[PDB]
Amino acid sequence: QVQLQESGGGMVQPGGSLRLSCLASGFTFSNYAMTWVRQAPGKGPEWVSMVSNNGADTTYTDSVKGRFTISRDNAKNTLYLRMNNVKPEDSAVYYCAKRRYGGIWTGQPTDYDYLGQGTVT
Amino acid sequence: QVQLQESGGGMVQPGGSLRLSCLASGFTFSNYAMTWVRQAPGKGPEWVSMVSNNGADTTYTDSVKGRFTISRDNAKNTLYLRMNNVKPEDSAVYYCAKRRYGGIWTGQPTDYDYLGQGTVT
Amino acid sequence: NDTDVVNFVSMEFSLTDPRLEPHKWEKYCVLEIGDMLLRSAIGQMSRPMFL
RNA sequence: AGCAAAAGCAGG
């Protein structure tokens, strides 16, 4: 069945790096686009990044360009996110989710599935 | 008695940061200059930085300029070193030591005291 | 002479609106230059920008 | 217009 278990998070220092991994199982992975969506304690969630099926069309938020790099590996059906130059405001709980459609821009960023975990710095 | 116990090290990813602390006890701290010296496994040690008694005169190796920041606190008689932009080759065992004299340039960098720990990335 | 005045014009950007304290400046000449999208802990502020 | 003051600038 469809489940998304993420890991790789932890404590870091400001201006460092982190490599978040997301393992998905239960569905056809190569068909659907993926999204990272974070939520800070107190504020409603905000989408972090949206990545395509081919891994060629990628989109980030207006405040994280140049600092982040989203990617995916279709062999192990897994999702990678490289966060560099961690600002203090990126301190939130990160979420890995599987888009409704196989697209990125068709429709506003909203998801219809479960979640794993996310660390804070 | 004179003892130098350091900590703060660990695993990091390339391009990250690290904050090494060194607590010294048994002598007059504010009088003697201090040194950070690292050693890669296989190669003899190499001096990383030399810091004054006033905390105003600091000097680093020719390959770590701009990336490191050495400092000291006379209250707890302790020595701090902040490393940013960790290169893969800076992966070595770090050493905290207390200079023969209270100076930095008078005499070549060599020490006469004990050691703590140092981590590797 | 060194005592002499030199006059000029000065442009320094500003977020906070006027008319909250119009007494503070009887001298400024405030323009509008649109929005700057500040990021707070929740949402986005999108306050205007004056000069 | 402004600066700043019990007098001057704002070119010669």
Side-chain angles (χ1 to χ4, degrees), chain A residues 13-17, chain B residues 13-17:
Chain A
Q13 310 290 299
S17 64
Chain B
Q13 309 292 301
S17 64

Side-chain angles (χ1 to χ4, degrees), chain A residues 12-19 84, chain B residues 12-19 84:
Chain A
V12 72
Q13 310 290 299
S17 64
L18 219 48
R19 180 178 169 98
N84 292 338
Chain B
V12 70
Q13 309 292 301
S17 64
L18 220 48
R19 180 178 168 98
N84 291 339

Side-chain angles (χ1 to χ4, degrees), chain A:
Chain A
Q1 202 185 357
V2 181
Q3 38 179 342
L4 324 174
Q5 286 158 328
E6 44 198 346
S7 60
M11 299 173 174
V12 72
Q13 310 290 299
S17 64
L18 219 48
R19 180 178 169 98
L20 291 170
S21 181
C22 178
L23 173 139
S25 75
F27 65 90
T28 50
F29 194 73
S30 169
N31 303 14
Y32 291 92
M34 304 299 296
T35 53
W36 288 105
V37 174
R38 78 188 168 203
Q39 166 167 22
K43 164 65 206 308
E46 52 167 349
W47 67 280
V48 159
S49 183
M50 306 201 283
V51 62
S52 66
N53 321 309
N54 304 256
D57 210 345
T58 58
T59 305
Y60 305 103
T61 324
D62 209 354
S63 65
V64 300
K65 300 196 191 311
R67 302 192 289 113
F68 288 170
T69 306
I70 194 182
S71 61
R72 47 177 299 173
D73 186 16
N74 298 325
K76 213 171 69 180
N77 292 333
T78 177
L79 178 66
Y80 302 157
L81 176 54
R82 165 179 283 159
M83 305 191 298
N84 292 338
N85 193 347
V86 179
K87 266 199 173 187
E89 65 159 308
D90 289 335
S91 185
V93 184
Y94 282 70
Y95 284 5
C96 161
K98 164 223 159 160
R99 282 286 293 277
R100 317 182 198 166
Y101 293 131
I104 301 88
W105 327 78
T106 86
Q108 292 68 13
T110 39
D111 211 292
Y112 213 98
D113 220 299
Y114 221 63
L115 193 274
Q117 67 143 351
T119 57
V120 152
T121 280

Side-chain angles (χ1 to χ4, degrees), chain B residues 6-30:
Chain B
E6 47 195 346
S7 61
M11 298 171 174
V12 70
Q13 309 292 301
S17 64
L18 220 48
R19 180 178 168 98
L20 290 172
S21 182
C22 177
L23 173 138
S25 73
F27 64 87
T28 51
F29 194 76
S30 169

